[PDB]
């Protein structure tokens, strides 16, 4: 999964698809945080 940079539209991209937004057509794409929260210990 990913997310747009202007409108923050929800997008899914493959390993070959162009790195663009479908609605706004921008070239800046952000990831999405790990949906499953993972517990950790600081060592």
């Amino acid at each position: 999964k990913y997310i747009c940079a202007e409108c923050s539209s929800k997008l899914s991209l493959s390993r070959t698809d162009a790195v663009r937004c479908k609605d706004c057509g921008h070239r800046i794409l952000l990831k999405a945080r790990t949906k499953r929260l993972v517990q950790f210990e600081a060592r």
Binding site: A5, E6, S8, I28, L30
Partner: protein, 70 residues
């Protein structure tokens, strides 16, 4: 940056009083010293906490973590 919850020196709590403190300044048009003493802030360290606070949370809030320029 939101108001500190506790006083760094005497352990007291000042976090909840910020909203009510802002009320006295323009609704009642009081001065700063009397407003500070109206809320039980008597040691000058608590007065230091409330008096010299820069509230930066109202500027980040008009903004998004995506696309700042330079």
């Amino acid at each position: 940056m939101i108001v500190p919850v506790r006083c760094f020196s005497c352990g007291k709590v000042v976090g909840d009083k910020w909203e009510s403190y802002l009320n006295l300044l323009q609704e009642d048009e009081l001065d700063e010293g009397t407003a500070l003493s109206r809320l039980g802030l008597k040691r000058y360290c608590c007065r230091r906490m409330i008096l010299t606070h820069v509230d930066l949370i109202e500027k980040f809030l008009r903004y998004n973590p995506l696309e700042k320029r330079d």
